[PDB]
Amino acid sequence: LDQLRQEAEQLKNQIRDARKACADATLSQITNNIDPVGRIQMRTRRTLRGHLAKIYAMHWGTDSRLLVSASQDGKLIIWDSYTTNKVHAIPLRSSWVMTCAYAPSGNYVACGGLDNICSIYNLKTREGNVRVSRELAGHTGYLSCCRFLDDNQIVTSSGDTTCALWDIETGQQTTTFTGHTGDVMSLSLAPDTRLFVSGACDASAKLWDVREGMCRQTFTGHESDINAICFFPNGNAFATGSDDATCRLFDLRADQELMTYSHDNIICGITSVSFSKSGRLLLAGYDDFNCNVWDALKADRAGVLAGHDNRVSCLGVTDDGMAVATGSWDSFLKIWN
Amino acid sequence: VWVVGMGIVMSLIVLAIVFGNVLVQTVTNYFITSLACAMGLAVVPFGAAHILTWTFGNFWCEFWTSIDVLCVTASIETLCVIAVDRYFAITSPFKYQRVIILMVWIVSGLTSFLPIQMHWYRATHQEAINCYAECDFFTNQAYAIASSIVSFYVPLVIMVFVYSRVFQEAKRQLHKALKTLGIIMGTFTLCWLPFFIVNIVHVIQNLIRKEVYILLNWIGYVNSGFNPLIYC
Amino acid sequence: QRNEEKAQREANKKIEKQLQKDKQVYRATHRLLLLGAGESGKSTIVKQMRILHVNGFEKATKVQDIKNNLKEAIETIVAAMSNLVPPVELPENQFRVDYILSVMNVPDFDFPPEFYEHAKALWEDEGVRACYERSNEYQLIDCAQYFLDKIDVIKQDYVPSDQDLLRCRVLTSGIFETKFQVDKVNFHMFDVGGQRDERRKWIQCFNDVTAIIFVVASSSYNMVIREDNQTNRLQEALNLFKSIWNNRWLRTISVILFLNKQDLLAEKVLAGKSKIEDYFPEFARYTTPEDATPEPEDPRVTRAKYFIRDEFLRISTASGDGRHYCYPHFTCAVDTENIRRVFNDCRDIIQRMHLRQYELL
Amino acid sequence: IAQARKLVEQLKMEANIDRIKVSKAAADLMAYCEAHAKEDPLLTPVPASENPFR
Ligand SMILES: Nc1nc2c(ncn2[C@@H]2O[C@H](COP(=O)(O)OP(=O)(O)OP(=O)(O)O)[C@@H](O)[C@H]2O)c(=O)[nH]1
Ligand SMILES: CN[C@@H]1CCc2c(ccc(O)c2O)[C@H]1O
């Protein structure tokens, strides 16, 4: 009964004491000896136009040439980034869409939404058309992200404090992860595809296991909701963007928030973050109509991208590390290099 | 001794109006482009040099007058079309959400260029023959009255009755409505009213002078720069 | 080769042509959003819109659903008779109660014909009717008395009659949409549903709707929210209205207010069992406004209606000065004519002329 | 009810986890970022002839 909470309090105190004892020196002292990168200036090489309403999601292809974007009017269209040519225009049953994804083999495109169903489409097939392959409707509440492990497995994270690992052929949940106390808003698989994270709305982030299916760790250093997450290219650290202006870089081994990327002149939120190829840059979208560029090891701003006319709601970096593209709410995508 | 710089100052002043007009998108925002396009840089500036006659080429005077006439007619038509579009949008909200501007411009060209290109002029009088042989401006055969009816009677036909129903909805719906409506019609009417009282006066009978008519027509030519400031 | 470039150009041209075709039809539509609380009547309005305008109006599924509501209603009244604080109780019917508890918890029921005979007899008990008059404490479905009386007609394997679909209640798990055209204009009405949430992080998506429709339970001022001992059902609606009005995202959206469920309020006010003054002390000194327009009634019931409307309106009249408007209304959802009589305010005509292109003056 | 019974066990499982010094992680991140800095076209601008986007 009431005696159970005492054990929880004692365990929390022990964990906090261990975390305090594990700290030796801040990253700033070690990394202050390097030379700053300097000012970074990039211009919009190309502009992608043709959407009607706001864009809510975007994902680059494996070949870093084709990208898929989803709008609020229910239209998935695949672009050709090199020559600015549309390829397909897939309508949807439900006009409300929040997610999209591109398969590693370039044969399927998955789009979820508020209709509680994460459907899968087929790109390369006979008769030269696109049709629904399977519809998975085991969740309750809206969806927030969708990702591909292979052609047969897809991971979703709904708004009922759950995350599940689906299966295309069977169309049923293989496993189920529980433990959060609020809506789940994002996730990002590891390069080794063995672990993945999830940023909830209770100012907490976890580290699940795909095979075993149990929580491993828990970081709760923030002060408000969480809206984005992404892994370092190493696979041993992730950066989290919250609702308040702070952006933090945690570490799996040390279990401590290494930095707090913040500025005194900003009071807006963060919608999406991502790294560069070598993990030296930390791009981050913002709700103040433009974007910003930080430095991973120095915690300072080194460039502003203000070529938009509304908030930025999606962001992505090519696998070849040659271009950086952003979406927005004014029906316009852009390519920066 | 001091009136020397007045003409150049006015010539330099209208350059600011031209710059303001050139400084300046939706379905109804495409019409303002015609008003911005349709004059003060070329036709209006020539008056300062003409105040001394320029007398370069007798063929050029016809173009000089015709350009101004066409610009005035185009501006009047554009304002009438703007009022008609606003009334159509406001009155019937059920069905409200290049083709007509070209037609309006085409309408202006027929009345202006054709009499000028045809060399048709007023009654051959001793003063008229002497002036035309050797810059006077006076027509005959009721050309002034007809041109005014095409380019001045359109406002009272449309602009007077366009807002009769719109302002009627103001009291029913329930100030600021009469604060801005008066500015749009007042500036338009006050500047473009006097010439309709002298063109009819001259042709009918004279009781008017050339200098006062020239001054009256010069006044109100600033409507080209006044309209860009009022709109948007 | 150049053939690939030509083919790609042709495909791009076709896609661009299709998008240009679809842009106008997307831009020529009106969208509406429903809001409210539980047991308010959001989906009834959409069902009535389906019944009225579009010709659309699984009969086997509706047959089971109507009977399912009847099965749940009978159990709730009998179960709370013993658990109620008062000693109110109904002799031979005690044998009927024996399998009532057994059938209360079951994955499924075959609906034997013997069940109907005993349920009807128990409904005729004087004591059973007494507990129905005191539904303030224990929660019970509003659409219960209508179905309880009409059993033999449904019993005599039957097709549901008219207004039977509009009275049965079915939970909306997901979104619930409906398209219709009234007069050369296509509308779009959708219900968010989704049980009950307290964060509403999806509200950022709806930043372009023309209007927001709000419906309240005007005849619920003495029963608590589904989770007990919280507050009066009216107060839970009042708090939700204040949060919606003072929202950063919905800073330029008008609100159409429906004071739904009117007939129940008239019936309950006539009886003196419950008084508004007890739950709402300020109503005792309230004086009816000088301006009024009663339909066709009793000043007692008429005075009650305007008091509830005044409380809702006083919230919007303070924090909103420009770009926010509130539109009171009086509607009864079940009655087909009343929503037709509102005609959505002559299509909220009052707005159509002023909001549109009048502001720029 | 029994919710706290599983939560305390999960927290106990979480607590018994090995931890390392922050200096080692900092050195590892710095070394990786210095080692893989050659193939990052965003830092060092790409030549126009070598840029597929220009
Ligand atoms: N007797 C009566 N009941 C009404 C009236 N209007 C609405 N209702 C009630 O509204 C219910 C409609 O159920 P739903 O369509 O699911 O709407 P809801 O009860 O608010 O539930 P949700 O849609 O989930 O919010 C019916 O069961 C009725 O009891 C009315 O005018 N008279
Ligand atoms: C010299 N300026 C002229 C004077 C008379 C006149 C103008 C334009 C249209 C007409 O119908 C006119 O009668 C003006 O451009």
Side-chain angles (χ1 to χ4, degrees), chain A residues 8 11-12 14 18-19 21 23-30 34 36-38 40 42 44-48 50-53 55-62 64-71 73-110 112-114 116-123 125 128-130 132-134 136-168 170-171 173-191 193 195-210 213 215-222 225-256 258-263 266 268-308 310-318 321-337, chain B residues 5 7 14 16 20 31 36 38 40 42 45 47-52 54-57 59 61 64-65 69 71-75 78-80 82-83 86 89 93 100-101 105 109 113-115 119 121 123 128 132-133 137-139 142-144 146-147 150-151 154-155 159 162-163 167 170 173 176-177 180 182 185-186 188-189 192 194-195 198-199 202-203 208 210 212-213 217 220 225 228, chain C residues 7-8 11-12 15 18-19 25-26 28-39 41-50 52-54 56 60 68 73 79-80 84 86-88 90-91 97 99-102 107 112-113 116 118-119 121 123 127 129-130 132 134-136 138-141 144-147 149-151 159-160 163 166-169 174-182 185 187-194 196 198-203 205-207 209-228 232-235 237-247 249-250 252-266 268-272 274 276 279-284 286 288-289 292 294 296 298-299 301-309 312-315 317-320 322 324-336 338-340 342-344 348 351-354 356 358-361, chain D residues 2 4 8 10-11 14-15 19-20 22-23 25-29 31-33 35-37 40-45 47-48 51-53:
Chain A
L11 273 193
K12 287 207 176 189
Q14 184 215 351
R19 286 205 194 184
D24 290 356
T26 175
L27 179 60
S28 292
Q29 294 168 18
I30 292 179
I34 66 169
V37 288
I40 314 293
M42 331 175 288
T44 65
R45 298 310 158 171
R46 272 170 191 83
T47 299
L48 296 174
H51 295 285
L52 294 174
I55 295 90
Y56 286 128
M58 150 183 185
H59 201 212
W60 276 89
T62 309
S64 86
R65 181 172 174 167
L66 290 88
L67 73 164
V68 61
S69 69
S71 166
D73 47 287
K75 283 251 191 202
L76 268 72
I77 57 175
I78 297 185
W79 307 72
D80 200 303
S81 64
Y82 278 163
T83 78
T84 316
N85 288 152
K86 293 169 250 298
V87 185
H88 296 98
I90 308 153
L92 298 145
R93 183 152 322 116
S94 64
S95 303
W96 325 105
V97 160
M98 321 195 168
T99 66
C100 65
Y102 209 103
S105 84
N107 273 358
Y108 303 92
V109 181
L114 190 150
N116 303 322
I117 307 180
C118 167
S119 43
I120 297 85
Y121 292 89
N122 196 339
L123 284 185
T125 187
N129 263 275
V130 287
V132 173
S133 182
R134 200 78 72 79
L136 324 172
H139 271 294
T140 181
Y142 62 101
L143 265 73
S144 294
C145 280
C146 295
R147 290 296 204 253
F148 271 52
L149 283 72
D150 53 11
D151 276 329
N152 206 14
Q153 293 170 268
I154 171 171
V155 169
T156 50
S157 66
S158 55
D160 65 303
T161 81
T162 46
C163 304
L165 161 58
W166 292 95
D167 203 300
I168 288 304
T170 77
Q173 315 195 14
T174 295
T175 51
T176 294
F177 317 125
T178 57
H180 272 165
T181 67
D183 302 342
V184 181
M185 301 295 298
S186 76
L187 66 95
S188 72
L189 281 72
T193 74
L195 312 163
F196 78 94
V197 293
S198 51
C201 294
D202 65 341
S204 71
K206 297 212 179 308
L207 181 63
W208 306 92
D209 198 357
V210 167
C215 179
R216 208 147 283 258
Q217 323 204 20
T218 285
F219 317 95
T220 175
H222 262 295
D225 297 286
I226 294 190
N227 284 336
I229 205 154
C230 177
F231 286 169
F232 201 74
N234 189 6
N236 272 321
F238 57 98
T240 289
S242 65
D243 198 288
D244 65 9
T246 42
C247 289
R248 311 178 186 264
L249 187 151
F250 304 94
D251 197 312
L252 291 203
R253 301 198 261 207
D255 291 331
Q256 311 214 19
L258 294 202
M259 310 275 168
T260 62
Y261 301 111
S262 83
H263 209 271
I266 62 170
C268 293
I270 297 89
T271 57
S272 299
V273 307
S274 290
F275 277 94
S276 166
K277 183 168 182 291
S278 62
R280 187 57 199 269
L281 278 297
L282 178 68
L283 294 96
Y286 273 87
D287 202 2
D288 63 358
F289 280 44
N290 52 343
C291 167
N292 296 295
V293 171
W294 298 83
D295 195 354
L297 306 169
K298 299 314 282 317
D300 62 358
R301 173 194 297 201
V304 178
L305 272 55
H308 270 295
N310 211 337
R311 77 192 303 241
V312 161
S313 68
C314 78
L315 191 148
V317 179
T318 61
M322 191 95 78
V324 175
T326 61
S328 57
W329 275 31
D330 54 328
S331 307
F332 283 168
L333 280 76
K334 277 196 161 55
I335 307 285
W336 312 66
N337 180 219
Chain B
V14 288
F31 284 19
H50 196 29
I51 210 171
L52 181 73
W54 44 282
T55 318
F56 283 34
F59 182 76
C61 176
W64 181 65
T65 61
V69 171
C71 285
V72 168
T73 300
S75 293
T78 302
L79 277 296
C80 176
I82 282 292
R86 192 140 311 163
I100 206 76
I101 297 169
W105 268 7
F113 283 131
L114 272 297
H119 93 282
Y121 63 92
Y132 272 92
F137 188 11
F138 57 100
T139 71
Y143 178 77
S147 57
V150 189
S151 284
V154 65
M159 311 275 318
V162 65
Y163 296 158
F167 197 50
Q173 183 94 60
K176 196 56 162 64
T180 176
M185 281 265 268
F188 182 76
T189 300
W192 293 98
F195 84 84
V198 298
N199 53 5
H202 200 32
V203 183
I208 205 73
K210 307 176 70 176
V212 55
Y213 164 100
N217 274 104
Chain C
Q8 189 163 290
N12 184 29
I15 295 313
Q18 189 75 18
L19 284 179
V25 67
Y26 163 73
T29 190
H30 292 268
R31 294 169 292 267
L32 308 173
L33 166 65
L34 297 198
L35 277 173
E39 293 179 353
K42 290 181 300 308
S43 306
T44 293
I45 286 176
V46 179
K47 281 191 209 153
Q48 263 204 350
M49 301 315 188
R50 279 181 181 174
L52 261 63
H53 287 58
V54 68
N68 217 306
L84 195 50
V88 57
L90 75 164
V97 177
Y99 44 89
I100 281 292
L101 302 192
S102 87
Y116 294 170
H118 281 271
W123 178 255
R129 298 292 180 85
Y132 173 55
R134 296 180 66 186
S135 78
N136 288 3
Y138 64 98
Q139 273 85 324
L140 189 136
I141 321 293
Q145 185 174 14
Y146 183 77
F147 284 170
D149 286 358
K150 291 174 65 175
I151 290 178
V159 56
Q163 217 179 356
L166 291 198
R167 197 61 73 96
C168 55
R169 176 178 183 270
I175 207 166
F176 182 76
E177 206 155 333
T178 285
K179 300 294 187 291
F180 68 102
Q181 187 157 209
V182 64
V185 184
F187 278 96
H188 182 182
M189 190 175 318
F190 44 83
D191 175 18
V192 60
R196 162 182 192 172
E198 291 325 326
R199 282 178 179 87
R200 309 184 193 93
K201 217 153 203 297
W202 43 260
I203 198 67
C205 278
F206 302 125
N207 209 3
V209 286
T210 70
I212 283 186
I213 297 186
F214 207 99
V215 295
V216 308
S218 179
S219 85
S220 296
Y221 55 82
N222 47 14
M223 321 166 267
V224 289
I225 308 99
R226 182 65 68 177
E227 64 89 9
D228 204 330
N232 304 350
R233 267 180 192 259
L234 199 45
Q235 196 74 22
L238 267 161
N239 288 8
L240 193 146
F241 180 45
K242 200 149 58 61
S243 168
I244 293 297
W245 193 272
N246 306 2
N247 218 351
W249 307 118
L250 316 177
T252 61
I253 316 292
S254 312
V255 165
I256 309 183
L257 200 70
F258 278 51
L259 304 189
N260 206 290
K261 206 179 292 186
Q262 265 288 335
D263 56 42
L264 280 192
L265 174 63
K268 260 158 59 171
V269 160
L270 294 200
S274 295
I276 318 187
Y279 311 100
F280 289 97
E282 311 86 300
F283 166 72
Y286 184 69
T288 185
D298 189 358
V301 54
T302 301
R303 199 175 49 127
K305 296 163 34 189
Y306 285 86
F307 168 52
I308 296 192
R309 181 185 80 91
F312 271 89
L313 201 49
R314 196 168 48 80
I315 293 192
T317 199
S319 297
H324 281 173
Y325 291 134
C326 181
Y327 296 74
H329 271 77
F330 295 88
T331 61
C332 183
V334 286
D335 173 316
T336 295
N338 223 316
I339 301 299
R340 164 185 273 148
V342 173
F343 191 27
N344 206 269
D348 64 85
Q351 169 182 208
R352 308 290 297 279
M353 293 183 284
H354 80 257
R356 179 60 178 163
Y358 186 75
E359 183 178 2
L360 62 80
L361 62 80
Chain D
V8 65
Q10 165 68 252
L11 183 62
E14 279 176 48
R19 304 181 161 51
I20 77 161
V22 189
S23 46
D28 289 349
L29 269 71
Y32 170 88
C33 202
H36 285 217
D40 211 296
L42 284 170
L43 292 174
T44 79
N51 192 352
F53 276 71

